[PDB]
Design a protein around this ligand. Sequence first.
Ligand SMILES: CCCCCCCCCCCCC/C=C/[C@H](O)[C@H](N)CO
Lengths: 245, 245, 245, 56, 232
Amino acid sequence: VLQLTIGNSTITNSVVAYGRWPEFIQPTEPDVATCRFYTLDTVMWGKESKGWWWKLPDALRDMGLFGQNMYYHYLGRSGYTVHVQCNASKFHQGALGVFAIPEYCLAGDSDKQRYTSYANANPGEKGGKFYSQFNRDTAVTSPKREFCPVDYLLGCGVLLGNAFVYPHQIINLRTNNSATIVLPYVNAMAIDSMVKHNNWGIAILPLSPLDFAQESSVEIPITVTIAPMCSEFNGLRNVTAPKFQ
Amino acid sequence: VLQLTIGNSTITNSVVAYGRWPEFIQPTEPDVATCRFYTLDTVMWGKESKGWWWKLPDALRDMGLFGQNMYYHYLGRSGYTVHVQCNASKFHQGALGVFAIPEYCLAGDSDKQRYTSYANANPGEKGGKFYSQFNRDTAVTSPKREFCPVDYLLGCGVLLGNAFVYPHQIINLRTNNSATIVLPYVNAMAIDSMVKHNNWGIAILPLSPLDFAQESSVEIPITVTIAPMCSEFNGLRNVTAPKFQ
Amino acid sequence: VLQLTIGNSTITNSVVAYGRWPEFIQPTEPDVATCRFYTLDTVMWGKESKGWWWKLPDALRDMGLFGQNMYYHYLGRSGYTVHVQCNASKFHQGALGVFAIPEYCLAGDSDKQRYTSYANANPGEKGGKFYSQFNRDTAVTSPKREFCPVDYLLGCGVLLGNAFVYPHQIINLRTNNSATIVLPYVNAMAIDSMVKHNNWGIAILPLSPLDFAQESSVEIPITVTIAPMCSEFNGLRNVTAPKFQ
Amino acid sequence: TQDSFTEGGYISMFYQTRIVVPLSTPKSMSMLGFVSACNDFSVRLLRDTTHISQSA
Amino acid sequence: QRRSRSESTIESFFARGACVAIIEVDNEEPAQKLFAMWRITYKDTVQLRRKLEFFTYSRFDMELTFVVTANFTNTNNGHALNQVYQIMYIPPGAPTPKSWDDYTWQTSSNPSIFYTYGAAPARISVPYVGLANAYSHFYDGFAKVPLKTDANDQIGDSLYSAMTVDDFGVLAIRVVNDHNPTKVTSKVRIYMKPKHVRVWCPRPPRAVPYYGPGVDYKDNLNPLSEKGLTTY
Ligand SMILES: CCCCCCCCCCCCC/C=C/[C@H](O)[C@H](N)CO
């Protein structure tokens, strides 16, 4: 609706998660190097798309100096401002539910429990995608150790309809083309490791299927832009180099 | 003499160059990520060593988050605290002149003027070494385009004896084993690019040859530790990746 | 560091055990006959020395009038000032841990428990010596009934490294050549028999082995001088004559 | 107890320059290490130590 | 407004004691269960687990109540005298029993309850013993990160959503009495009651059967039943 300027990045309803604005608690605080909007890779919303999911701060691990501070320091905390952009014409119809889940633990694909690997559990800016059904992994010799989120189960054994208990925003193409959620730092500790722990999960679900006129196939872009807010790090040491394979 | 604590690094006369302490002038200022002592690779002072030279901030280009901020931002400024360590026994004799030259331009090795390449002019933490005489480059087909510093000419056409006009410290093994120079930011501009311009040059010359008892060959280590002070950067953009070859 | 004058004996950091100075509680108090430094027999610290131990007041049982008062009276109390002297050159290296253990009970050498004899448990000014390993007594016919202290076990089943919980002083030849510990009277009673009960144990352990230049065998003297302080006796009767054999 | 979630960090030691000794001096020396807690230190949830055991 | 919400409060919502574990302890001639070690958690049962997982973070003081029920096993006329059960709490790091008469049962510093059979169920209270500022029902992360310099992948391999292997220790339950000539089998049921409960970040309730200590789902993934669109 109005100008949204952070650092050196400006974006032309916005919901504050849990009514709490990001806030600070000698932590290293880059007021400019990290407090800015980083744009994730655009995804394509089609008529056969089940959904998308990203993990924060994992999605910003390779975003400018924020990732460098995240890997160099031991433990850091950061709020976020997520902005989802999806522009469509008056003749397009659809709705996206954008949910910011605290501790968005997801279910695996194998009978073995909690067997998902770090590489698969931390996809980065590409994120992942939900599925209509639960596909059980059958590669016993070389298990994929990847999540198997289910659209209507939200990937966590709960019903999608109740996901609105989480902070949420609905992009309904007939009325609005963008959503904005301001997430504070949510954790059981005032500050925690970012490389191993993800504080937030952004799930975008097509509540209503996309459609345009009488066209058989229609696809429109969705772009996610995340701004770290009041991010502070502590425990400076040699750089961490996670094995992503 | 006394404890020297900066950030998370502590070192157990110290001269302030030009009697000016490093000082600040929305620049990005990492108060902890950059304000700390980084130790350069140790060199070996022998009886046939002519000298060593490093360029600042080039020597700290790959030192933690200071290098990341240097490459990510457009223009930055930083003071320095250089600490040279060389421990020897009571029976060792020698003296090192440590000079902090502003704009320490060096002479080339070819008849072509100002033909030194960026890769050779920016050695990094390894630095370079002076030479007794001037060796003219003869590889016309593939010129080396490297400096040819001369010990008694200081590598700049001036006499070594007058180099004491610069900020300096003498490590005389009989009285002291370490030297400490505090350099403010010196430039014609309040802030300038660090990737292309080096503000300081640290030259260590063996004023008196090293000797120990009646031993024919003696070598002792020299370790340089540099702490950026009041370093602030501006002009954040994609990361710079210089071609060092 | 400074003059240390007691009675008619003067010695040219000093630690007060438990921060308590020796103090008095009609006890017989010789202010001069007993309050003076008595020098024990010098021992020789070599490269194959495991340690030494003495028991107080047993070590002063034959030292001037202090021993006479100790044997004549029934029960007496006395603080001590222990001064260990070990002078070495700049080219000697080593370290001695001098520990004042309250109730320094030691382990025996036989399978029989608490079978150590009074004669062996009270060596006098000569003291005893620790051993690298535990040598089990095998003379069933004539058991020696002597202690078998172990250097790393401190002779009491505890680790040597934790012995610093006791009052201690480190004679490091590179920095200091003497140690001084001031022990108050420590016991479960305000005054107790001295002939049967030893209040303190002085253990000197070579924390770092002695070495000198490249010499194969080097030995230097260690001299212990103990000054009774605020010693008072009570229960005068005929003289006690312990059987030392 | 050993736990990667409450891991505390690492302690390392390196030669900054070297050990330099003259002639007629031992070229090999020994260093000792001591550990202590600061005034901010605190412990919680008393338990039984695993160091001492008794044959039953 | 005269109708109140006193019973919908978080404290009232958890003010009931929920069974979290059933432990079998047998006394017989000494492959055997003379002592049973049970790891402390509410995830062995679904009801209290589901109630707690209504939220993401919690902080509560716990109250444990032990109900012991003993029975004979194929006794003809062999009988037993009243038994005493020892329930010893072993926090992480403390030694664990290897037998029913091990030295660890001395309980020099490990708290223990000696319960006499036929008496009231044994009740004690525990404060908030969390390392962090609140309990984490859901942990979107690992405890180890696999690094490029790791020699093998197993160094950094860790279970997803697992914080610590030994969360809060175990309870070791034995029968202090020596073996009677006839076997006696007892079941100890542990009932956990949160108190002074505080919760944060509400979550939707579980809709499908639990499968393990995590959010994993395996079967019965079709909860909703058939119903007409326009049928009342
Ligand atoms: C004989 C005395 C018994 C003493 C019992 C002490 C056990 C201590 C356990 C306290 C907490 C256990 C249950 C609460 C923690 C929850 O599982 C958290 N959500 C952890 O994820």
